[PDB]
Structure formats: C-alpha cells, structure tokens
C-alpha cells in the first residue's frame, strides 16, 4: 500500500498473509473457517504445496503468538483469464479449520450482484510495497479509497484516491477491498505503476462471484 497508514493491530481479523518460506507474497481473506479467497494471479505458477496460509498476523517482521498457519488442501478456480484480466479469484481450502477468535474472523460478503456506485468509500489494505522505493511492509497497511467507474470495465470494481498519489502495490495482490462493511473486492491489477494518480486500481468484483463462492463454502 502506497500512501496509506498502519492498521490498528488485528483491526481486520479476516486479513490473511500467503507465504513461501516465511516470506509474504500475497494477501487473502478468510471467508469460512476452512477457506480463504485470494486473486488467481497469486497462485498461477506457484508451488501451491509450499504455500502457507497465515491468519492472525499484524507485523510480519515479528514473532506473533496470535498466528495460525495452514496449508492448502485444494484450489477452486472460476475461469481465470490473465490475457483479458478476468475472473481473478481463487478459493483455497485449508488443511484444517481456523480457530475463530479476536484475531481471526470470517469476513462478510455482499449479496450476489450488489453494485457499487461512483463515490463509494472503501478501505484497501495489505502488506504490499510502501512506495516506489520506500520498501515492502512489516505492519499491515490500510488506505481510504473511492469507487470509480471511469477507466474501469464492468468486470471490475475500481478505486482511485482523489487529490494525491496513493494505491495498492505489489504484494497487495489478493487482499480484500472492504466497502460498507463487506468484502467487495480482491486486489487484481494496477496500471501506470503503483499510485499513478491516474489509473484506478482494479479489483476482482466479489459480488459477481457470490453464488459461486457460496456453492463451495455453503
Ligand atoms: C501477473 C502479475 O503478477 C500481476 C500483478 C502482480 N499486478 C499487480 C501489481 C501491483 C498491484 C496489484 C494488485 F493486485 F494489488 F492490484 C497487481 C499487475 O498489475 N499485473 C498486470 C501486469 O503486470 O500487466 C499482473 C496481473 C496480470 C493479470 C491479472 C489478472 N486477471 C492480474 C494481475
Ligand atoms: C496444516 O498444515 C500446517 C502447516 O504445515 C506446514 O506448511 C506446509 C506448506 C508444508 O510445508 C508442511 O511441511 C508444514 O508442516 C500444520 O502445522 C498443521 O498441523 C496442518 N493441519 C492438519 C494436518 O490438520
Ligand atoms: C476512511 O475510511 C474509514 C473507514 O471506512 C469505513 O469502514 C470500512 C471498514 C469500510 O466499510 C468503508 O466502506 C467505510 O467507509 C471511514 O470511516 C472514514 O470516514 C473514511 N474517511 C474518508 C474521508 O474517506
Ligand atoms: C469503521 C469506521 O471507522 N467507520 C466510520 C464510522 O464510525 C463513522 O460514522 C464515519 C464518519 O463519517 O466514518 C466511518
């Protein structure tokens, strides 16, 4: 997250870090005790058997007893189309069930087909890069963003920070966009580099996928 701020610790207990050899590479969202959802581009080409699913995290550079770690049992995809930047969602079934507590909670999803109007206020978040060269992030970041339809296709929810350069960045891939208390987005792609101040950030439109999601998690 570029130009965002540190989250209060465990403010977003559905927020997940996906990791390889102890290094974060992508965000995800706990949507049931034994399922997370993330971006399909996070796991394309990745050794899924080596992926660790980290719940209850805040500061990645610190040892944290609030943490629970799972492996991926199964992957569910929904037509990921990287050429057209479409259907950028996967569900990873875990090898066990999360222990739901103060630091680890299941996110709430919108109704199928819910649309977001121009001007909707959302929070993006993640452990992605902090700038062009500021560094990647230890502490979970969040960011106020506004839903926009200009320079956005119907097949995305897009957001733009007004009046300054800020936005999601590398490593924020697969992280939730929260709007009106619900996970409306999964960070999918940027244009013009991170925080261009021109192109909106694009997210997989979770509302479009809810019937598919419910079929899997129930
Ligand atoms: C392949 C790859 O690694 C990409 C990353 C990481 N991000 C990217 C970069 C910074 C932030 C984010 C975030 F997800 F957070 F929005 C994403 C991009 O933008 N990309 C587009 C490209 O490289 O052409 C890639 C991409 C390609 C296809 C889809 C689809 N559908 C999604 C992303
Ligand atoms: C689920 O997996 C947990 C962590 O497994 C570890 O990470 C994966 C990616 C592999 O590299 C593996 O060798 C590691 O042990 C376990 O700690 C946990 O017990 C598992 N739960 C089960 C089997 O129900
Ligand atoms: C910045 O964001 C704050 C928190 O956002 C609210 O709660 C999150 C979890 C989402 O549900 C989001 O849709 C809500 O807006 C807001 O309280 C605050 O007012 C925002 N400030 C500005 C100026 O945008
Ligand atoms: C989650 C959160 O902090 N939400 C706040 C809400 O409490 C407040 O009513 C509003 C003020 O406009 O800003 C938003």
The token pair that represents 21 in the structure block? 């050899």
- CB crowding 57-84: b at 16 or more within 10 Å, else e: bbebeeeeeeebebebeeebebebeeee
Residues lining ligand 3, Cβ inside 6 A: 121-123, 144, 178-181
Residues 23 and 63 in one domain: yes
Residues 170 and 213 in one domain: no
The conformation of residue 108, written as its DSSP 8-state character, comes to: P
Q: Which of 17, 24, 58, 88 is catalytic?
A: 88
Q: How far is the CA of 70 from the centre of ligand 2 (A)?
A: 6
Classified as helix, coil or strand, 208 is: helix
| 52 lies in the same domain as 155 | no
CA 9 – ligand 1 centroid, Å? 27
> Do residues 85 and 162 both lie within one domain?
no
Specify whether the CB–CB gap between 148 and 118 falls below 8 A: yes
- Alpha-carbon span 167 to 195, nearest angstrom: 5
**CA-wise closest residue to 166 among 146, 136, 184:** 146
Q: Which residue puts its alpha carbon closest to atom 3 of ligand 1?
A: 41
Is 63 in the same domain as 81?
Answer: yes
Cited resolution, angstroms:
1.8
Same domain, 73 and 133: no
Cα–Cα distance measured from residue 29 to residue 148, given in angstroms and rounded to the nearest whole number: 23
Quick check: 158 and 143 in contact, CB under 8 A? no
CA of 65 to the centre of ligand 1 (A): 32
Residues 54, 25 contacting (CB under 8 angstroms): no
For residue 185, give the nearest of 168, 165, 161 by alpha carbon.
168
Residue 139 CB burial class (10 angstroms; 0-12, 13-18, ≥19): middle
Structure obtained using: X-ray
Gap between the terminal Cα atoms of the chain: 32
Number of domains in the chain: 2
Q: What is the CATH number of the domain that holds 77?
A: 2.40.10.10
Handedness of CA 145, 121, 43, 98 (dihedral sign): positive
Domain residues for the domain of 43 are: 13-106+208-218
Residue 24 falls in the annotated catalytic set = no
86 with 48, same domain: the answer is yes
Asked if 52 and 114 sit in the same domain, the reply is no
């Amino acid at each position: 997250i570029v130009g965002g701020r540190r989250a209060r610790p465990h403010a977003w207990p559905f927020m997940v870090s996906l990791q390889l050899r102890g290094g974060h590479f992508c965000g995800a969202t706990l949507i049931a005790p034994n399922f997370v959802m993330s971006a399909a581009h996070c796991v394309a080409n990745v050794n899924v058997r080596a992926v660790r699913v980290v719940l209850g995290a805040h500061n990645l550079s610190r040892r944290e007893p609030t943490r629970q770690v799972f492996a991926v049992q199964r992957i569910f995809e929904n037509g990921y189309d990287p050429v057209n930047l479409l259907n950028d969602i996967v569900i990873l079934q875990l090898n066990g069930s999360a222990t739901i507590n103060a630091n680890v909670q299941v996110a709430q999803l919108p109704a199928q087909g819910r649309r977001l109007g121009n001007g909707v206020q959302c929070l993006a978040m993640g452990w992605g890069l902090l700038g062009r060269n500021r560094g990647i992030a230890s502490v979970l970041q969040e960011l106020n963003v506004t839903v926009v339809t200009s320079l956005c296709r119907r097949s995305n929810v897009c957001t733009l920070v007004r009046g300054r350069q800020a936005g999601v960045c590398f490593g924020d891939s697969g992280s939730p966009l929260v709007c009106n208390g619900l996970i409306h987005g999964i960070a999918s792609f940027v244009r013009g580099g991170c925080a261009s101040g021109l192109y909106p950030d694009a997210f997989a439109p979770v509302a479009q996928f809810v019937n598919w999601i419910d079929s899997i998690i129930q």
